[PDB]
Amino acid sequence: MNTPEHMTAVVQRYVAALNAGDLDGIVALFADDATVEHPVGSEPRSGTAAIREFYANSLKLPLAVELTQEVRAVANEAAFAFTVSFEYQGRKTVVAPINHFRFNGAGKVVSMRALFGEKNIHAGA
Amino acid sequence: MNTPEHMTAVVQRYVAALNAGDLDGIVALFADDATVEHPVGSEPRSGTAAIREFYANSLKLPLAVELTQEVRAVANEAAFAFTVSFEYQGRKTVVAPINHFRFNGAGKVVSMRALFGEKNIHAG
Numbered sequence: 001m002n003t004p005e006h007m008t009a010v011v012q013r014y015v016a017a018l019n020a021g022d023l024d025g026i027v028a029l030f031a032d033d034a035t036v037e038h039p040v041g042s043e044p045r046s047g048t049a050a051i052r053e054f055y056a057n058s059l060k061l062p063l064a065v066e067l068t069q070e071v072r073a074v075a076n077e078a079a080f081a082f083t084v085s086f087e088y089q090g091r092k093t094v095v096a097p098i099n100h101f102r103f104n105g106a107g108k109v110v111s112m113r114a115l116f117g118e119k120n121i122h123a124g125a
Numbered sequence: 126m127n128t129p130e131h132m133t134a135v136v137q138r139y140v141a142a143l144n145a146g147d148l149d150g151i152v153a154l155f156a157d158d159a160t161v162e163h164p165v166g167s168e169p170r171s172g173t174a175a176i177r178e179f180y181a182n183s184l185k186l187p188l189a190v191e192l193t194q195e196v197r198a199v200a201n202e203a204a205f206a207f208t209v210s211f212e213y214q215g216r217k218t219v220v221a222p223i224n225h226f227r228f229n230g231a232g233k234v235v236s237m238r239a240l241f242g243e244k245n246i247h248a249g
């Protein structure tokens with residue numbers, strides 16, 4: 001099994017990597033054949049190239065990402081509450097998702113699902 | 126597809142029914158063919174009779190429950206952060222899971238999963 005400490009560390013490193021604008025850092029958390037599903041209910045992005053593309057696009061704006069509560073880690077899975085803040089043309093957005101990671105045997109992430117809706121996107125005006 | 130309003134209010138009723146020790150009310154939120162998996166990793170209890178006994182058992186001690194952040198609701202799913210507290214034999218325990226609901230076409234919860242580890246169980 002994965003250890004909860006390893007999963008929690010991966011979640012923390014993922015946030016730090018977002019904050020550092022570190023694309024290779026993020027992508028390396030993932031399995032070769034992982035999936036990102038963003039938002040929940042959309043067609044999952046699949047494989048390294050599509051994952052790299054999703055995060056490359058995500059990082060076009062400077063992000064302030066913040067783990068808002070302790071990570072919840074059990075078996076081969078982790079879930080976490082966080083915020084992602086950004087600003088474009090003088091307009092602030094704070095999104096509050098809850099994300100879910102499944103890990104494989106090697107301790108790599110095999111799926112990401114980002115669960116959030118419109119009521120979780122918060123504007124500055 | 127379910128409304129985020131509806132999935133959100135269901136999360137509120139759930140928390141309320143836990144606080145109220147209102148067993149019938151927790152159970153009515155779930156579909157006939159729902160399953161509950163608590164903690165993620167265990168064998169899912171399945172169907173109305175097994176779900177009721179799951180709650181009946183948890184409700185042997187009075188539960189103090191509260192959402193610690195906004196609900197997230199999208200597509201047919203909601204996820205929520207919360208603490209659940211109880212007191213037995215002179216010890217207070219606080220657990221902080223994140224739960225995940227899937228809803229069916231008719232607005233009932235057809236799947237629940239409680240995500241928490243040892244580090245989310247707190248002994249004061």
Ligand SMILES: C[C@]12CCc3c(ccc4cc(O)ccc34)[C@@H]1CCC2=O
Pocket residue numbers: 088089091
């Ligand atoms: C600034 C601008 C008009 C307004 C505007 C632009 C780009 C992004 C924006 C984002 C906003 O949230 C509000 C206004 C703009 C244009 C780019 C060039 C231009 O004239």
Ligand SMILES: C[C@]12CCc3c(ccc4cc(O)ccc34)[C@@H]1CCC2=O
Pocket residue numbers: 143163183188209220222224239241246
């Ligand atoms: C299962 C639960 C979340 C976790 C939890 C509950 C009750 C007692 C518990 C006791 C524990 O040692 C660990 C976790 C729980 C809640 C009852 C309803 C609910 O959603």
